[PDB]
Design an enzyme around this catalytic site. Structure first.
Site, mmCIF file in Angstrom:
data_model
loop_
_atom_site.group_PDB
_atom_site.id
_atom_site.type_symbol
_atom_site.label_atom_id
_atom_site.label_comp_id
_atom_site.label_asym_id
_atom_site.label_seq_id
_atom_site.Cartn_x
_atom_site.Cartn_y
_atom_site.Cartn_z
ATOM 1 N N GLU A 184 0.831 -1.211 0.000
ATOM 2 C CA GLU A 184 0.000 0.000 0.000
ATOM 3 C C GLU A 184 0.866 1.263 0.000
ATOM 4 O O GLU A 184 0.873 2.027 0.981
ATOM 5 C CB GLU A 184 -0.951 0.002 1.211
ATOM 6 C CG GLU A 184 -2.043 -1.079 1.161
ATOM 7 C CD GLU A 184 -3.068 -0.947 2.287
ATOM 8 O OE1 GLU A 184 -2.932 -0.025 3.124
ATOM 9 O OE2 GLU A 184 -4.016 -1.763 2.335
ATOM 10 N N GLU B 146 -6.836 -7.983 -0.102
ATOM 11 C CA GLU B 146 -7.269 -7.918 1.291
ATOM 12 C C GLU B 146 -8.698 -7.449 1.355
ATOM 13 O O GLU B 146 -9.111 -6.562 0.616
ATOM 14 C CB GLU B 146 -6.407 -6.953 2.133
ATOM 15 C CG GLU B 146 -4.941 -7.315 2.221
ATOM 16 C CD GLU B 146 -4.133 -6.288 3.007
ATOM 17 O OE1 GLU B 146 -4.737 -5.405 3.655
ATOM 18 O OE2 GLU B 146 -2.891 -6.367 2.968
#
Lengths: 107, 345, 341, 107, 345, 107, 107, 345
Positions: B149, B272
C-alpha cells in the site's frame, strides 16, 4: 423480456447429459457481469461446469460468469457456458430463467 | 505440488479465476520484528492444510523485508528470512494452491516522492532482484505482488488518493519492480505479477491514474477493499449489514473496478478484505456471503485478511482461523464466504 | 437566435455555473404552492448579476395535463413556463427545462413501459413544439430522477430492469424532441442516469440515445451526503480527506464521460443550513473549483427555504426582497468557478 | 485445435428440431468475419436460420456471420447462431466443422 | 408494399443485413439530359419486378438533380422530375424492397473547397430539404444517400484521396446534408442515411478521415469498390480472375472496411461495384460469386452497377439486365452474384 | 518532476501582450484535469483568456483546463492555452509554476 | 481557416532565441500526421528542434511531427513543438503557415 | 560506441524516431551458404563508416542462421558465425548507430502451420536463446527482430495474407521468440524488439490480425513495403514515378499503418523498402525523397534494402552503395532519400 435464454442439449447418455446455455441480450443496455438463475428440476445434479461457476441452494441454481465473458453486449450480444448433469426420469429443462433479476424469454 | 508446474501464456483473468478465493497469513511474515512478534504462532504445514481444506485456493503471504536487509548498495536480504518465506510458500504449494509474495510494511524506505525516487528505485531493484532470484524455479502458481500500500504517510492523508506526485511515483516504482523481477530471467520473465494502485485503493482517483508497467498483459491489479468501511473496519461503526442500500453500494464499488479493468481484459485481485468482530456473527455472515458472490460476478477474486486476532468487541479483529487449535474461530463467517464464491463442481 | 454546431463541452463551459428555481414550477399544486412567491423578471435579473449564467427551470407537468391519448398540457401552464424562461433569455442566460416530479406516471419497469412511452412521447412533442423557436441557449432535460419508488431504494442504483427502462425512456424522449424538427433537430439535450446518480452502477449503464453528440449527461451530486444534505450529519467540511473524497467523486465522472468527449452538467447540488456558514463557504468554493477542473458545470439547488437548523434548507436567494439569505456561500461558489476575463 | 464448436439441440419434435451452435475461439488471434462449414447428416434440411445466413449444396453447409457478430474474440470469445431443421431417422449431429479454414474440435 | 411501414430503432447493421444485395438503376435518373438520354428505355414496374424476382432486395436509384433545379436562393427542383423519381421508387416498394435515393452527378456545383463551402452548403441544404420533404411519409425502407462521389475536379485526381482540405469539406457537406434531412422532422428524423467518403473511396486515406455527422448511429457508410480495378474496370486490364492472389487481395480490401467500420458497429453499404464485359463470362462468374460471399462475410451489402450497357469488348459495359426484354444479358454473372450472397431460408 | 511549462510571448503592443502557455507532461501518468498555478508579477492584469479559465487571488493566479483539453497525456503529451495581459513597466514572466501540486520546469 | 498557428517567443538572448509553436485544429476532421510549412525570415537559422523534425531548403521550412504527437484532434485539439534559432538584426516572425496544404490563421 | 549504453524505459516511438533512417546489409549474412556467397565482398568497418557518414543512423543486419546450426534438440549455432555477426554489429556501434539483428531466410524450417508448430517453437526457442545470450550485455541500441517474412511456402501464396491458421501460428511464433529472448534476462528482458506481421506485409488482412506478444509496449511492428510495387520492384513495371496519383497512393499505404498502429502508440519500422535500377535516376530520386518524407510524416522509420547489386536494367538491382569502392553507385538516390528524412538540427 429483451433477454433470451437458449438451453440446449449437446449430448446425453441416459444417466446424464451435457448442456450448453446461450444468453442473448436484445435490450439497449449491456449486461455488465451477468448472473443467471433458475429452478433445478427434481432429478438433476450438476456435476461440473465450464466458462462459468455456480452455487446450488435447494432447488435453486445460481450461475455466475467467468469474468472474460462477463459482459453481454446490447442489441443481440451473447455469452455462453456449459455443464454436465446427472439425471433420472425424463430429461426436463428449466421453465424459467432470470438474468440479473430480469425474467428471460426461453427459446 | 503446484510449486514447479511451469509458466503458461493464458490471459491473466484465467489465472485470477483459478486463484478463486484466498486467505492472508496476516500479522506474520509481515510483522515488524519477525514472524511471531505480533502474537501469532510459528506457522506450520498443518495450519495451511486447514486453509486449503476449508475451500481457499490462494495463500497470500505478505512479507515485510525492512528489518531483514543490509544497507546500500546491495541491501542484502538475510538468507534465513528468505528461506523461511520459501518454506511457508511450499506449505501452500504442497496443497496445490496459488501463493502471492509481496513487499509489505516497507514505509520506512519505500516513499513515493520525487526527492526519494532515485534511492528508492535502487533499493527496490536490489530487493526484487534477490527475491526473484530465490524463487526463479517456481512456476505460475507463484505470483509476485510488487508493493503493498505505497502512499504518503501522515494521518490526514490516510484515506486519500495522495497527490499527483505520489501517484506518478507509484507508477514509476511499479515499473522498476516489474523490470527488476523480469531481468532475473527464466520463469520470472513470464510469471504473473500483481501491482497496486496508490494505497491499493479502489477509489476513482487511484484506479484512474494506474499505469500498467509496459502494458504487460501478465500484470494483474492489486486492490484492497474493506467495504463498506463503517461495518467492516470501524469498531465504532454499525454492527449491521444487509439492506438493499448496503447491497447496492457494495455492488457499485465492484462495478467501478469491473468497468475500469475487468471488462477491458485487465484482471484484478482484491488482495485484502474482510470484517472485524463486533460480536455480530449474523451480520458478518450476510456480508461475507454477499461480498463473495457480488465480487465474483465482476470477475474479482477476494482474499480475506486474517491476522490471527478474533476477539469480539475489539478493533482489528479480522482473524477467523484459530492457528493454535487448527479450528475456525469464525466458522459461520468462513463457510458463508466460501459458499458465496461457488465453484465448477 | 439560432442553434450553433459546437462541441457539447463548449456549451457546458458557457453554461458555466447555474441556479435552480426550485420548489416552484416543480411544486405539486402550482407555482406558489410550496411557499415561494410568484416568480418575477427582477429575481432572475439578480441571479444573473451574482454571476450565474444558467437557470435550471424544473417543471412538474403532472397535474397540468389531460388524459390519453393526447395528454394535452394546459396552455396557461405552458405559457407561464415560457414566460419565466424569457426572464432568463433577456439576461442572455442558458435555460434548462425538464420534466420533474412525474413519479406517479413515469415508472421504470417493463410492465409500465408501453404506457409511459406513449405519454412521454406526447408530453415532449408538446413541450418541444412550444419551445422550438428558441436557440441553443435553451436546453431540454428529458427526465429528472427516474427511479423505482420506495424509500429503501432511494439511494440505490435500482435493478438492471430499472436502468434498462430508464435508457429506453431517454431514447423515447430524445426521439420525440428530434422528430419535431427545426431547431429541435439540433438542440442540446440533457439525459439523466437512473436517479440522476453519479454512482458507478448508474453511470456505467447509461446509454446515450443514438450516440447523439448533442446529448449531455445530467447528474445530481449533493456531495458529500452527510455534510451537504443530512440534518444529523457533520457540520464541518474542509479536511484533506474531505477534499480528496470530493475530487474522487468528480474523477469518476471525468474518466467515464468528460475525458471521452461526453459533456456533463451537475444539475443539482448544494448544502443545507446547519448554522455553519464558514464550513459551507469552504465547501461551496472547493466544490465549484474541483468540479470545474473536471469540465463540469454545477447548478445550485435553491428551493427558497433557508431556515438554519432545519432539513432541506438549500435556499440561498431571498425572493421576497431580492437579496441573498446566504451571501457568503453564494459568493464563494461563484468565486470558485472563476472566469475568462 | 484452438477452436471449439458446440452443436446442441434446443428442442426436437420427431420430424424437426431446433439447433444452437456456439463457436469458441481459444487461440490468440481474433477471427474477424467468421464462416463455419460442415457436412450435414443425411435426411436433414435447414428450414430457417437466425444470427447468420447459409448456402447449402447437397449436405455441404456454409454458414456466414451476421456482421454484428462477425468477430470471435481471442482467448475464449464466443459467437452463437441457431436454426431449425426438418429430419427423418435418428437426430444425428455433424462430426466436424471448419472455421475460416481451421479444423475445429467438436465439444 | 414497404413504402409506409414506419421507422424502427434497430442497429444500422440489421438494416444493412435486410438490404442484403442490390442493383443500380444506372445511367437513368442519373443521366444528364433526361431519363432516356443515355440510352436506357423508360423505366417500368415490370423491370423492377424482374429485379426482385432475381433475388435483389435493394434498388439503388441514383438521381442527378443538377439540370432539374432553379438558381439560388431556392434551387427549386422540378416537381415533375421529383414525382417521377418517387414513382420509380414505388415500383420497388411494391416489391417490398429497400430503395436508396442519392444526389449523383452534381460535380458542376458540388465543389469540396473552402472557397466554395458557403454557397455549396446553401444549395445542399435547399436540395435535401426538398427531397426529404417530398419523401417524408416513407418508412425505413427508404434510405437517403447524401452525395455520390464528392471530390476535387481534374482527370489527374480521379483516383486520389484529395487534399486534407477536400476531405474536411466533404465531411462538412455530409453534416450539412444530414442536418437538412433531419430538420424536416417526422420519419426523416429517424430514417437511416448513407454518407460517402471522399470519392466514395475505400482507400485508407479516405476511410480514416471520414467523420460521421453528429456521431449519428443511424448513419451508414457508402463505399464504391469496383475491385480489383484492372479486372473489373480497366478495358486494357486482365480478363482473368480467380487465383489465390486474386482472392486474398479482395478479402484484404474488405478487411480494411471491416476493421475500420463494421466490427465497431458502423454499418457499410458498397453502393456500386461490378465487372465489365471482356467476353470473359467464366472469370466474371468466378469473381461475382466470390465478391458476394467475401463481402457478406465482412458484413457488407454490395450493389451491382447496371448502366444497361453490356456490349462485349467495350469499356464501361457493366449492364447485366436487359430492360427492353425483361431478361438478363448476363444470366450467369447475375445468378453467381446472388448465389454468393446466400440467405436465411 | 517531469512536467515542463513553456510561457511564451506571441505578440506585444506596449501596454499589453498576448501570451501562449504550453504544458508538457514527460511523466508516465496522464494528468487528468490539469490546473496550473503561478505567482503573478505586480502590474500585470489578465484581461481575457481562452482554452482555460482562471481565478486571481492576491499574487496567486490559478488556471483551470477547459474540459475538452483537460488531460495531459503521458510521455510527451501537451495542452496549451493563451491570454492577453495589460502591463506597465517591464514585462516580466512568472518564475515558478505548479501543475496539480507538482513543481514544473520552466523551458 | 479552421487551423490556427500560434508562433511565440519563449526567450531571446540577442544572438539567438527559443520559439514555441502551437497548432490548433478547429475543424471537424482530425489531422492524421501533421506537417507545417512556412517561409523563414533571412538571417535566421534553426539550430535545434524538439518534438518535431525539419527540412530546411533556403528559407523554406518544412516541419514534421514526431509520431507520438502526429494527430491534431478535431474540435480544438492542439499539438506543439519548439526550436532554437540563431539570428542577427531584428527578430521577426513568419506571418503565414500551411498545415498539410491548408492555409492557417495566425494568432 | 553505442554498444553498451544500458536500456531506457521510453516509449518505442522515441526509439524509432532516433533510429531515424536505415540501411540494410542485404544479401550478406542473410545469403545462403555464407557472407560472400551471393556476390558481396566481406563486410568491413570502413564500409559501415560510409553508411553513417551519408546520414543513416540504423544498420539492419539480416542474418540467415539456417546452415550454421546443428540438429535438434540443441540446434547449436556455429560459434564463429555468431561472433562474426557480433563483429559487424560493432562496426555500427562504433558509429553510434542502432543495429537490428533478425532471423532471415529460415523458411526451410520456420513453417507456420499447426502441424509444424511444436517443432518450430522448439527450434525458435533454442535459436533465440543462443543469440540473446551472446548479445546479453548490449544496450537498447541493439534491437532484435524475431523473424523476417514468415509465411506459407509456395509461389502462388507469396503475395497473399495466408490463411487464418498461418496468421494465428505466426502470432504464436512471435510470442515464443519474444519469451525466449526475455527469459535470458538482463538487458534482453527490457530491450526493444521488432515483430513482423505474416510476410511482414502491410496489407489489411495481415496488419489487422497481428497480435503483439504480451501487449508488450517495448515491441515494435516490422513491415516491408517496396511500394509502389510496379515502379519499385517489377522489372517490367513503369519506370516513372511522380504523378499526383502516385503521391496519393503512397500516402494512403502509410495511412493504413498510421491509423492501425502509430496513432495508437504502437511504433513501426519499415525494415525493407527501395527501388530497382531501370535507368531512371530522376524518377527514383523523386520517389525516394517523397517516400522518406511521407513515411516520416506518419512516424515511420524506413530502411533501404541494399543487396549490393546496382546494374541498370536488371531485376533486383536495389544496391546503392558500392562496397568495393567505398563510394555510392546511386549517389543522387541516396542523397534524396536522406534529404526527405530531415533532422533535428
Amino acid at each position: 423480456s429483451a433477454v433470451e435464454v437458449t438451453y440446449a442439449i449437446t449430448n446425453s447418455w441416459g444417466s446424464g447429459a451435457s448442456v450448453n446455455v446461450t444468453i442473448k441480450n436484445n435490450g439497449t443496455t449491456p449486461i455488465n457481469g451477468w448472473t443467471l438463475k433458475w429452478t433445478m428440476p427434481i432429478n438433476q445434479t450438476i456435476t461440473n461446469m465450464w466458462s462459468a461457476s455456480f452455487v446450488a441452494s435447494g432447488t435453486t441454481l445460481s450461475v455466475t460468469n467467468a469474468g472474460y465473458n462477463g459482459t453481454i453486449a446490447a442489441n443481440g450480444g451473447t455469452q455462453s457456458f456449459g455443464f454436465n448433469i446427472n439425471y433420472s426420469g425424463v430429461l426436463s429443462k428449466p421453465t424459467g430463467f432470470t438474468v440479473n433479476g430480469t425474467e428471460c424469454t426461453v427459446k | 505440488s503446484t510449486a514447479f508446474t511451469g509458466v503458461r501464456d493464458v490471459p491473466a483473468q484465467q489465472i485470477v479465476n483459478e486463484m478463486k478465493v484466498g486467505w492472508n497469513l496476516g500479522n506474520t511474515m509481515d510483522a515488524i520484528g519477525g514472524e511471531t512478534n505480533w502474537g501469532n504462532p510459528m506457522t506450520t504445514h498443518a495450519m495451511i492444510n486447514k486453509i486449503k481444506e476449508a475451500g481457499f485456493n490462494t495463500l497470500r503471504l505478505p512479507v515485510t523485508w525492512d528489518g531483514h536487509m543490509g544497507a546500500a548498495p546491495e541491501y542484502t536480504i538475510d538468507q534465513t528470512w528468505m528461506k523461511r518465506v520459501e518454506e511457508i510458500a511450499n506449505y501452500a504449494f504442497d496443497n496445490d494452491m496459488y501463493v502471492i509474495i509481496n513487499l509489505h510494511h516497507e514505509n520506512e524506505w519505500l516513499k513515493p516522492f520525487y526527492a526519494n525516487e532515485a534511492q528508492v528505485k535502487a533499493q527496490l531493484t536490489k530487493v526484487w532482484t534477490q527475491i526473484a532470484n530465490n524463487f526463479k524455479k517456481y512456476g505460475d502458481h507463484l505470483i509476485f505482488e510488487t508493493m503493498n500500500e505505497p502512499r504518503p504517510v501522515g494521518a490526514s492523508l490516510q484515506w486519500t488518493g495522495g497527490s499527483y506526485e505520489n501517484r506518478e511515483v507509484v507508477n514509476r516504482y511499479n515499473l522498476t519492480a516489474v523490470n527488476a523481477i523480469r531481468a532475473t530471467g527464466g520463469n520470472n520473465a513470464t510469471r504473473y505479477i500483481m501491482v497496486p494502485t496508490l494505497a491499493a485503493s479502489a477509489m476513482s482517483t487511484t484506479i484512474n491514474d494506474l499505469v500498467i508497467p509496459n502494458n504487460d498483459s501478465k500484470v494483474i491489479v492489486s486492490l484492497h477493499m474493506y467495504s463498506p468501511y463503517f461495518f467492516a473496519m470501524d469498531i465504532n461503526g454499525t454492527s449491521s449489514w444487509g439492506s438493499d442500500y448496503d447491497k447496492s453500494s457494495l455492488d457499485s464499488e465492484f462495478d467501478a473496478v469491473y468497468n475500469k479493468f475487468v471488462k477491458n481484459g485487465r484482471a484484478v485481485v482484491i488482495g485484502e478484505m474482510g470484517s472485524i468482530n463486533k460480536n455480530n456473527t449474523a451480520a458478518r455472515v450476510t456480508h461475507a456471503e454477499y461480498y463473495a458472490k457480488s465480487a465474483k460476478a465482476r470477475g474479482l477474486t477476494p482474499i480475506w485478511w486474517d491476522n490471527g486476532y478474533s476477539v469480539a468487541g475489539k478493533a482489528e479483529t479480522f482473524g477467523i482461523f484459530n492457528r493454535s487449535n487448527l479450528t475456525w474461530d469464525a466458522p459461520e463467517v468462513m463457510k458463508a464466504f466460501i459458499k458465496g464464491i461457488g465453484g465448477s463442481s
